[PDB]
């Protein structure tokens, strides 16, 4: 469902997320109106999940990062879609990964201190119907600099 | 390095976190400073490394199969970890790199078109190098948090 114009738009935006629409529309060889509409369409269809700024090692000021693999009870599995929803709304949570392995999902989280992390685990995980969790320390995370 | 950020820098980072495409004029107006001053401040933030970059097109548009590959290096190869990633990041399939403190040295969030592509990534970029082993696992869904930063 992607035409080559959308492909050029996506490639250029991948390389320059901050690219002004005039320059983008000109580089693609389209009109600014049509370019903006195409991009809005792309965001709407979920083709672009969003545009983001990669802020710091999170050290300013969430220096403590973690990966929490969560296993739910067998009866609670039916509620999985809901569980993620409410939990995505939580401050500390940045990413959610669903895997095809032993764990139901993994939570990539950021916290201020050990007390903040512990607070997240206790209030959001330990106080619910989920079997268990394994928290492992994140030392650094990096995006990837590869062109499309 | 925290604490070398004023309320203006804070407002800038907060506004720019979710909306990387917020125009400089709109940003400066919302923060209540002149656009020139704002540009200097954003440039400042990028320079300090406080802003690592601006980037999220899905993946199913060419790479419908996603994986998480946990890598364990040799005890002798560990010292060069910084270099390893420094190369592995440039590889087309890798989306994320996490350094961990568990048994495995790091985990790689990657995207590939098919299982053969994934297998090729592991063989040619990992298996044919000085790293002890890898465990490649399937990703079914990926999410970011819809929380107001």
From Swiss-Prot, chain B:
Description of how activity is regulated: The DNA-binding activity of AldR is modulated by interaction of AldR with various amino acids. Alanine, tryptophan, tyrosine and aspartate completely abolish the DNA binding ability of AldR. On the other hand, glutamate and asparagine reduce AldR binding to DNA but do not completely abolish it. Binding of amino acids can lead to structural modifications and changes in oligomeric association. Activity is also inhibited by 3 small molecule inhibitors, tetrahydroquinoline carbonitrile derivative (S010-0261), levothyroxine and liothyronine, which can disrupt the AldR-DNA complex.
This protein's GO CC annotations: cytosol
Any one GO molecular-function label of the UniProt entry: sequence-specific DNA binding
Keyword annotations from UniProtKB, A to Z: Activator, DNA-binding, Repressor, Transcription, Transcription regulation
Keyword Transcription: yes
Any one biological process term the GO annotation gives: response to amino acid
Consequence of substituting residue 102 to T: Forms a DNA complex that cannot be inhibited by adding amino acids or other inhibitors
Top-rank taxon: Bacteria
Domain HTH asnC-type: 5-64
The entry's DNA-binding region: 24-43
Entry's free-text remark on domains: Contains an N-terminal DNA-binding domain, followed by a rather long linker and a C-terminal effector-binding domain, which is also involved in oligomeric interactions.
Function: Transcriptional regulator that might play a role under hypoxic conditions. Regulates the expression of ald, which encodes L-alanine dehydrogenase. Serves as both an activator for ald expression in the presence of L-alanine and a repressor in the absence of L-alanine. Acts by binding directly to the upstream region of the ald gene. Four AldR-binding sites (O2, O1, O4 and O3) were identified upstream of the ald gene.
Subunit structure: Homooctamer. Homotetramer. Tetramer of dimers. The N-terminal DNA-binding domains are swapped, forming a dimer, and four dimers are assembled into an octamer through crystal symmetry.
Name of the protein this chain belongs to: HTH-type transcriptional regulator AldR
Organism: Mycobacterium tuberculosis (strain ATCC 25618 / H37Rv)
Segment of the intact protein contained: 28 to 178 of 179
């Amino acid at each position: 469902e992607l035409d080559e114009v959308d492909r050029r738009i996506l490639s250029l935006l991948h390389g320059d997320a901050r690219m002004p629409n005039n320059a983008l529309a000109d580089t693609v060889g389209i009109a600014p109106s049509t370019c903006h509409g195409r991009v809005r369409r792309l965001v709407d269809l979920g083709v672009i999940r969003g545009f983001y700024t990669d802020i710091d090692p999170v050290a300013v000021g969430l220096p403590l990062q973690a990966m929490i693999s969560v296993n739910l009870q067998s009866s609670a599995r039916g509620k999985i879609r809901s569980f993620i929803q409410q939990i995505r709304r939580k401050r500390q949570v940045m990413d959610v990964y669903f895997l095809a392995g032993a764990d139901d999902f993994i939570l990539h989280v950021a916290a201020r201190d050990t007390e903040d992390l512990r607070s997240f685990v206790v209030e959001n995980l330990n106080a619910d119907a989920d079997v268990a969790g394994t928290q492992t320390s994140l030392i650094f995370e990096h995006l990837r600099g590869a062109a499309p």
